[PDB]
Design a protein around this ligand. Structure first.
Ligand code: UOR
Length: 133
């Protein structure tokens, strides 16, 4: 029951500072522009100890499956090859990606009826708000 309140289908309803976040991560112009238009569906499911997160949009369809605290390799929507670890910290899903000596953290939080995603790279944060589909 570890992630019960995250499970479901979520749709993006707002974004702030995502272009800047993508710049900070190193995404090039054309990818930023097309990725920034996307309105993804985030589909979260749990089966035993395995959590699956899908992100589906006109830009890219991605899927990760993982066990909390157990590192895995991920190819991101912007084509970085990263080492990822996802943990639960005080009810927040904390996703850290490491690649080429860099790091970014993506936090997923339930707030009222929303699922709030905060993406941070060095001093640049973006907030992406999802509602139930
Ligand atoms: O599927 C996603 O959630 C997604 C992820 C990105 N992204 C680019 C650099 C880091 C993340 C862009 C656009 C989308 Cl739609």
């Amino acid at each position: 029951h570890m992630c019960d309140a995250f499970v479901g289908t979520w749709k993006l309803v707002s974004s702030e500072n995502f272009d800047d976040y993508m710049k900070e991560v190193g995404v090039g112009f054309a990818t930023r522009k097309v990725a920034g238009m996307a309105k993804p569906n985030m589909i979260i499911s749990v089966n035993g100890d395995v959590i699956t997160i899908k992100s589906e949009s006109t830009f890219k369809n991605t899927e990760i499956s993982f066990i909390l605290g157990q590192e895995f390799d991920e190819v991101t929507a912007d084509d970085r090859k990263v080492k990822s670890t996802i943990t639960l910290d005080g009810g927040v899903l904390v996703h850290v990606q490491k690649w080429d000596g860099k790091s970014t953290t993506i936090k997923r939080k339930r707030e009222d009826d929303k699922l709030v995603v905060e993406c941070v790279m060095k001093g640049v944060t973006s907030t992406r708000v999802y509602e139930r589909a």
